[PDB]
Design a protein around this ligand. Structure first.
Ligand code: HEM
Length: 448
């Protein structure tokens, strides 16, 4: 049987993990050149990772069923955050029901109210922080702030937001986040070892679950004492019932809320940040004009029609930011049985990977891939994979872009911006979710 070509190993027991970490785009491009193949295999702490770096074969990573290409082992390092037996740790049918419940909290009907809640939080942030004629800010830090405030305003009732304000929720989530070791996918002994990480994570998740149980009790009180429907993500998920006939446990509800914050917080804020950095750069003046024309006749209070139906150009600007610098660099599954991919067989036991970073710089699909051009279209069907595809395609895609677009429309309607650098920031590949380098993100705002 014919295996993909394997990139030569120099470093004994580490393999390619350090080369890859230093420059993931650079390293993977060098692999495909030397090995004369978009499908090739690297070595991560002794483990074979086969990369499907030919966009013509993306469907062989995204479409196979979970029993063939499994997400469980790849997400096992996130078990302390999601919770044991929740999401990818659950049997696949139950995993899919839980994911569907979350998806169903992000319906089009919900979006009707989301728009003015998002815009409210954005304007409140700009009034507190961008309050003069002009001033200097760190755009990545402020976009991250706006995104946690906007998402919480959409997803959580006022009562939950008071108890668990954006500041307290950020601290708890940061505590969970600082516990993750993605390298545990390749060194799975780490999943069993005693780690101080594990205990900090369990503490923060337990505190969150405690606050949720307390809010649920407080809600029951308000419903008794006066009227008091509060309808939000928490109440929606608690109303969910499996085909089993059984309802979701608080444990599972807490895990799904956590899953939604980890999936959508850094991705959304980074997409916003890059979009803004590109649009304020002088080279992109025509794109900034196109966005300004797009929003020119919108009312001061945006509605769902403006954002969802009337901003196709702003959506190209966000997608092309993710195209050029995808926040998730590598997507992975465990190969549970041999799979043929192009001319190769990828053996059972391999990690198979598909990299948005590598595929989005394929020069046949994306000519001049470092150039940010929201007018571009992929030249190979399906080569854009910044929201994944197929069986685990992103469920938050529309909600994320709803906030990115509302922030763009609100910010550029009232402000101009200037980069304090000649070029847009370099991507910083040293974080789990990749964004522009934070120290390079100082910008000047100018009230219009
Ligand atoms: C706007 C920026 C976003 C980006 C670039 C992004 C990207 C991605 C990608 C690449 C995947 C596929 C992962 C894989 O194949 O292993 C994914 C899945 C997922 N995303 Fe998003 N995401 C974004 C926003 C959101 C938001 C805002 C939420 C929730 C509110 C969300 C929820 C999810 C969930 C639950 C999954 C797992 C789907 C499954 O396993 O079936 N995402 N996302």
């Amino acid at each position: 049987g014919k295996l993909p070509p394997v990139y030569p190993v120099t470093v004994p027991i580490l393999g390619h993990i350090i080369q890859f970490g230093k420059s993931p785009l650079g390293f993977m491009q060098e692999c495909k050149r030397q090995l004369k193949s978009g499908i090739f295999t690297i070595n991560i702490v002794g483990k074979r990772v086969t990369i499907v770096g030919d966009p013509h074969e993306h469907s062989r990573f995204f479409l196979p069923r979970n029993e063939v290409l499994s997400p469980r082992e790849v997400y096992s390092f996130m078990v302390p955050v999601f919770g044991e037996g929740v999401a990818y740790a659950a049997p696949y049918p139950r995993m899919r029901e839980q994911l569907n419940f979350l998806a169903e909290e992000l319906t089009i009907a919900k979006f009707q109210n989301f728009v003015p809640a998002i815009q409210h939080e954005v304007r409140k942030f700009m009034a507190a922080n961008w309050d003069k004629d002009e001033g200097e800010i760190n755009l990545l830090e402020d976009c991250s702030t706006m995104i946690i405030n906007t998402a919480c305003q959409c997803l959580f009732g006022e009562d939950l937001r008071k108890r668990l304000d954006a500041r307290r929720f950020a601290q708890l989530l940061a505590k969970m986040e600082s516990s993750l070791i993605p390298a545990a996918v390749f060194l799975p002994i780490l999943l069993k070892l005693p780690l101080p990480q594990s205990a900090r994570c369990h503490e923060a998740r337990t505190e969150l679950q405690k606050i949720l149980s307390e809010i649920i009790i407080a809600r029951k009180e308000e419903e008794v004492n006066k009227d008091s429907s509060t309808s939000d993500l928490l109440s929606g998920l608690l109303s969910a019932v499996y085909r089993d006939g059984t309802p979701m446990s608080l444990h599972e509800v807490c895990g799904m809320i956590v899953a939604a914050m980890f999936a959508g917080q850094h991705t959304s804020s980074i997409t916003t940040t890059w979009s803004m950095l590109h649009l304020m750069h002088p080279a992109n003046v025509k794109h900034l004009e196109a966005l300004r024309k797009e929003i020119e006749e919108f009312p001061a209070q945006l509605n769902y029609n403006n954002v969802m139906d009337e901003m196709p150009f702003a959506e190209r600007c966000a997608r092309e930011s993710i195209r050029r610098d995808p926040p998730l660099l590598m997507l992975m599954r465990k190969v549970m049985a041999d799979v043929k991919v192009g001319s190769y067989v990828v053996p059972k036991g391999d990690i198979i990977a598909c990299s948005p970073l590598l595929s989005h710089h394929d020069e046949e699909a994306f000519p001049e891939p470092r150039r940010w051009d929201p007018e571009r279209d992929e030249k190979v069907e399906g080569a854009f994979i910044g929201f994944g595809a197929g069986v685990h395609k992103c469920i938050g895609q529309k909600f994320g872009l709803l906030q990115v677009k509302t922030i763009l429309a609100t910010a550029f309607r009232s402000y101009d911006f200037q980069l304090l650098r000649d070029e847009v920031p370099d991507p910083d590949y040293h974080t789990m979710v990749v964004g522009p380098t934070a120290s390079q993100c100082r910008v000047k705002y100018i009230r219009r």
